Amino acid sequence: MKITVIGAGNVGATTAFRIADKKLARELVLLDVVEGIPQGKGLDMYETGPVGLFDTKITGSNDYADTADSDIVIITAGLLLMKNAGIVKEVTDNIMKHSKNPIIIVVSNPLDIMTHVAWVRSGLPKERVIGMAGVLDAARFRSFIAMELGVSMQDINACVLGGHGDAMVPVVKYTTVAGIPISDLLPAETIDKLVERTRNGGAEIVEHLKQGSAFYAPASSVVEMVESIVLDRKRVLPCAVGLEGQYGIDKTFVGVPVKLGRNGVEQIYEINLDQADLDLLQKSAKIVDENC
Amino acid sequence: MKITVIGAGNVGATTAFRIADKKLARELVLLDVVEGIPQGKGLDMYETGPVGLFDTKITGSNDYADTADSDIVIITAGLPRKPGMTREDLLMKNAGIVKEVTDNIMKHSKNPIIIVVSNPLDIMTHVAWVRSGLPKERVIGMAGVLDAARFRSFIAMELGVSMQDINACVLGGHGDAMVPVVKYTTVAGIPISDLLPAETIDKLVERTRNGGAEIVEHLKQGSAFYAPASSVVEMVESIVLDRKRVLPCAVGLEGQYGIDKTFVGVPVKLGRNGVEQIYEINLDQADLDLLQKSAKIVDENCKML
Amino acid sequence: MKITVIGAGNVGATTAFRIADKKLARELVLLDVVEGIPQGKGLDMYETGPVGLFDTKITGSNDYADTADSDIVIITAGLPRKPGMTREDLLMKNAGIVKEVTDNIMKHSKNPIIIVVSNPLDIMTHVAWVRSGLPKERVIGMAGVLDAARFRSFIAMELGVSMQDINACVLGGHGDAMVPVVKYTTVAGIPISDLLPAETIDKLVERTRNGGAEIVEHLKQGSAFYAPASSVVEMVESIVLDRKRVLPCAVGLEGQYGIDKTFVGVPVKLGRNGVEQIYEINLDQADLDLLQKSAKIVDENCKML
Amino acid sequence: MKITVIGAGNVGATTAFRIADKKLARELVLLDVVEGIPQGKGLDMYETGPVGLFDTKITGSNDYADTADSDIVIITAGLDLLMKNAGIVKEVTDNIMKHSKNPIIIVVSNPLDIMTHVAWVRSGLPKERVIGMAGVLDAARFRSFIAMELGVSMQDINACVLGGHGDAMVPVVKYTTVAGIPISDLLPAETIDKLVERTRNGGAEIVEHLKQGSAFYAPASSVVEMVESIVLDRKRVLPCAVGLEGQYGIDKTFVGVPVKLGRNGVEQIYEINLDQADLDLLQKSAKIVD
């Protein structure tokens, strides 16, 4: 099991270190354009080995020839639509020149548009190119609820599809606590509130840090996707995948529930949304084709 | 179990997160003097509870009142040494910062155990101790563990074996103050002098001496934090779960190794009450003198403040 | 955190071991009336610490004095019915053992939280609670988690997903006492009725009702213990780590579900203080009826004792 | 990663479970001779997955066809005691090889050294892929005995034990440390002598207690230790029973010595510097074990 992470910023590195800590890889390589930073973080991590009790092999780098034969490749190269578009494009063309068939996990922004670009340049079966966005929105929504009711977050489930911001589409009917729907525990408008906080969730953290962006929750989400693929668990998680018929949408990427195994997207789950929700989902997938 | 971590830079945050992720505390506070930074890192850290499977209450703040009744406090504020900065120039900022933090938290926690990670370690560990007013068994600094880490990973790269089967004995402090005892560095209870060439051992020892500098060389700005943060937690764990680990740490001595009253890194048994036992191993002359040497020099700076 | 486990058969040992290897206690006692077995097994578990990486005091004995001041006490005495046994015979032998043990444990531990795992469940959890003297929030029984566990494992064999993405709601008690709620059983928040035909669902439901017997069919001369022991611990963890998990357990009611003073299995919030909240879910009349009815069955058996 | 355990007694059962709980496998198979037992314990473990939080495919069985293409195979079957168990190992082996091309094999019988030998020959595999567990167990007991003596974590105690069990055990005092410190600088020679004695009779101590059976918690954790190294390719260094072709002056025999475990098994054997006293004893050990 060998994994490559592109981008040595807070997201890429936090992801890398978590992967070695849980022993979900034998080899790992942190890579970036700028000389210095990656080689640094990788060594520190490796030196953490005798304490964490893990024997992974970490190494930062600036040379793509090290990414050769990677089973999994995560792209965090993101900063605007023009800027990130050319970046993902170039990152992908390169990784493909050294790895035959990897599972790519996009993490840029706008997330869907960027996952679309990667896939087209990868020349890979769409069952190997995914985007991380559902697990994050769901993690925040789950945390606000736990604050509202005071229960372990392990016993909560939140349903979120679509994209981010005004393109996000949460499904109240499938958000429960120990199986119990949320609409039987909290008032409707009190819920409309927890929802709005989730849409602007990423811009709230940014408001504090003054500089940069959140990275603890976003990086852990990516590792849940990795853990399922590596251990072949068959978890069911919301991700940005390519549709072709489902939900009345064809030829474009959107966030919907899916089963994840050692082969990637091993099954898409199509669920019953009501009028207002399904409408939005189809409305979100549209702006994407408008810029792709 | 309530735990406070002072300072929201890469070293503190990473230490706070890992503590939460390991379920070693029920409540955790992240405090710094800056405005939104501790608030943001704290929230994003909590929003990870779902994925990580932990229920620790996490709060980032600017108000020391939030640390009331903490069982353990960890100081990281300060910073190593900004490039192009004077050695005495840093012995001023940090010493002034460490005695101010300690001052403020004793206003809310009466008998915590404190762990210092402010540089230079051996000196600052002494400053926090006196300002606190606690018995010496309740104040320790983190330093031996991290050097034993890097040193153990170099022996691994050379022999190609598991880092879990290598024990590295490292006394003293950093720089030329470090006292790596090779006669007690093993692989499956076998002295590395029986395996490696004396020529290579010396080179491994020298890399350990400048280990922190190596990282900073590549990062250009700021310093290492993954290995340090994890070395601090290994100590936290032995306390929280009363393991009685025999680990190398900075503690005040009272006669052993010929030294008295000064803070030196040596083998100690760590438990719920702190420093529960100190071991005096049979160092050969050369090492003993080197330790008594870097010890007296420490006394100096404590006498220039 | 001291913990005691009464009974050293297969369910007791397996739980004692899993608490150590998971590092949930510092001290751990394994009690059992016969001289020899509790000794050899405890020692064998202790000699496992070098390999499991845990430092927990473990020991087995034949004297209740070694349980002094336990915070959590777990009873596994009172083996389930035997082949040629009547419900009358078992209810007699077991209530006689369950109250003689409780008497002894309260003669050394003043305020422990007790977790009952004897047969029949709901009745023995009531017997222990009246001999104890503790508030009802500190005496609970294990059953709902084991049943919901088997149910989830069954739904997974069907849809081929992670046992971790399935919620299984199960109230009442074992056998025909069991009241599995389908409306609130899901996969990623999706009710299984939206993903499975009525015929299959009903089969999974009935495999759960006789689950334990299914394990005795293969074993031939004994009952299950791996799954049962782990369900026990799941609960121990919520208490010790103050997680506040929502799980179905055997607790005393006083109004909700129109039930009063009787021990029933329902959804309860678990913390460091035992039972901190009981939920009243919007069940459908048919299931609500099965519950109230099955409860009076407990009230009947309790008086004949 | 697919593993197979043979024997559903306390040892192999506990063993299969620990592997499942550690997520060290995708498919596990518990096979035994009698019907019922292996299918019951196996289903029990599987129904634990929703709580232990794993998704390992476990299954009990009585038909060797389910063990096809196993990476690791753990033989833990064992009850003229010598010829008794020797025949059981031969049988088990032949069948396994009938369904798996190239697997790593771990023997857990008695006598261990001889049993691992019998398994190797019938195996027809490179001696590098057939090994026996014993050293790691005696060391875990020694390590715990000392910790009880000093009151220190067991994670900081290292123990050196070569050879076989009982009168064939060879403890190397000079390599038994505590955070690097030899134990001869911490404890009296009389105290050490008793700690060594108690270890020589370590298994008979648990047996005289239980009065019906034998240890299995420590024995099973030891085996999983070896499995993890191979699976995760850590390169751990542990004392296991291997076939020697010269080292320590012993030839064509299986005896316990430090080795390095990787994905391909025995990736290196270490010939440590024993003292004229113990060396002579290790030679007389492999003498009867020959």
Side-chain angles (χ1 to χ4, degrees), chain B residues 2-3 42 109 118 134 168 224 271 298 305:
Chain B
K2 188 177 175 178
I3 297 186
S109 291
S118 310
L134 309 163
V298 172
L305 293 166

Side-chain angles (χ1 to χ4, degrees), chain A residues 176-251:
Chain A
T176 69
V177 178
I180 317 307
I182 62 175
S183 57
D184 286 308
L185 298 165
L186 313 181
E189 86 89 61
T190 293
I191 285 179
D192 278 305
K193 187 196 67 183
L194 288 247
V195 158
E196 287 304 295
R197 195 183 184 184
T198 302
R199 293 178 184 295
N200 305 302
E204 193 194 321
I205 294 297
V206 145
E207 244 306 285
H208 296 315
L209 308 178
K210 180 182 74 292
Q211 312 289 306
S213 298
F215 59 91
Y216 283 100
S220 295
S221 298
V222 176
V223 178
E224 195 161 43
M225 297 165 77
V226 173
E227 192 211 3
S228 184
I229 306 183
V230 177
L231 300 176
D232 196 27
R233 295 192 90 189
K234 316 288 187 186
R235 306 283 317 268
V236 190
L237 317 158
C239 309
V241 296
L243 295 181
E244 31 183 41
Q246 305 91 159
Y247 303 77
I249 307 170
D250 190 45
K251 287 183 171 183

Side-chain angles (χ1 to χ4, degrees), chain C residues 64-252:
Chain C
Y64 279 82
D66 302 332
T67 67
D69 302 287
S70 304
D71 296 283
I72 289 175
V73 182
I74 296 162
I75 308 173
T76 69
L79 189 172
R81 274 200 319 99
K82 290 185 173 182
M85 285 213 106
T86 68
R87 287 187 174 180
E88 201 62 3
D89 290 39
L90 188 77
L91 196 86
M92 301 280 285
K93 304 298 169 52
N94 285 15
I97 294 163
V98 166
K99 66 164 56 181
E100 151 271 295
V101 162
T102 295
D103 284 345
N104 278 303
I105 98 94
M106 295 303 286
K107 196 184 299 181
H108 296 279
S109 301
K110 265 182 164 286
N111 189 213
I113 282 173
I114 308 179
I115 288 168
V116 187
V117 195
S118 294
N119 308 88
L121 193 80
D122 306 7
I123 297 179
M124 298 292 105
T125 305
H126 178 90
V127 176
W129 172 73
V130 313
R131 292 297 283 195
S132 74
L134 314 164
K136 60 172 188 291
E137 291 73 28
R138 315 188 84 270
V139 187
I140 62 175
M142 194 293 287
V145 173
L146 175 57
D147 291 317
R150 283 168 179 156
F151 194 4
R152 287 159 72 190
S153 91
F154 296 153
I155 301 180
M157 287 174 85
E158 205 62 49
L159 294 170
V161 294
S162 187
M163 277 170 271
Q164 176 169 298
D165 288 323
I166 308 160
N167 179 50
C169 187
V170 181
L171 314 192
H174 287 314
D176 286 292
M178 197 179 305
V179 181
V181 190
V182 178
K183 174 175 54 179
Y184 300 134
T185 293
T186 70
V187 178
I190 289 296
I192 53 173
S193 72
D194 283 56
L195 311 168
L196 288 178
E199 312 83 86
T200 310
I201 294 182
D202 284 326
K203 284 197 62 182
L204 295 179
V205 173
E206 297 303 326
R207 187 177 178 185
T208 305
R209 290 191 188 273
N210 298 285
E214 162 167 44
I215 303 293
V216 201
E217 189 230 308
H218 301 297
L219 290 182
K220 295 154 55 181
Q221 286 197 62
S223 28
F225 49 82
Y226 291 108
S230 304
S231 291
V232 175
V233 172
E234 172 95 0
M235 290 165 85
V236 171
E237 171 191 288
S238 208
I239 291 177
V240 175
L241 301 183
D242 197 55
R243 304 198 57 186
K244 308 198 177 319
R245 298 294 301 303
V246 195
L247 318 180
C249 308
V251 301

Side-chain angles (χ1 to χ4, degrees), chain C residues 13 18 21 35-36 44 46-48 50-51 54-55 149-150 152 154 162-164 218-219 225-227 230 234, chain D residues 18 21 36-37 40 44 46-48 50-51 53 55 140-141 143 148 153-154 209 211 215-218 221:
Chain C
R18 190 175 176 82
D21 185 53
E35 308 187 306
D44 182 50
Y46 186 68
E47 303 180 342
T48 304
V51 176
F54 63 77
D55 302 296
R150 283 168 179 156
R152 287 159 72 190
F154 296 153
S162 187
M163 277 170 271
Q164 176 169 298
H218 301 297
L219 290 182
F225 49 82
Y226 291 108
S230 304
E234 172 95 0
Chain D
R18 195 172 182 66
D21 190 46
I37 309 301
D44 192 354
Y46 183 97
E47 304 182 315
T48 303
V51 160
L53 290 183
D55 290 335
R141 282 181 194 165
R143 299 169 61 174
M148 266 180 251
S153 171
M154 290 176 277
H209 275 301
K211 271 166 281 188
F216 64 92
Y217 281 110
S221 300

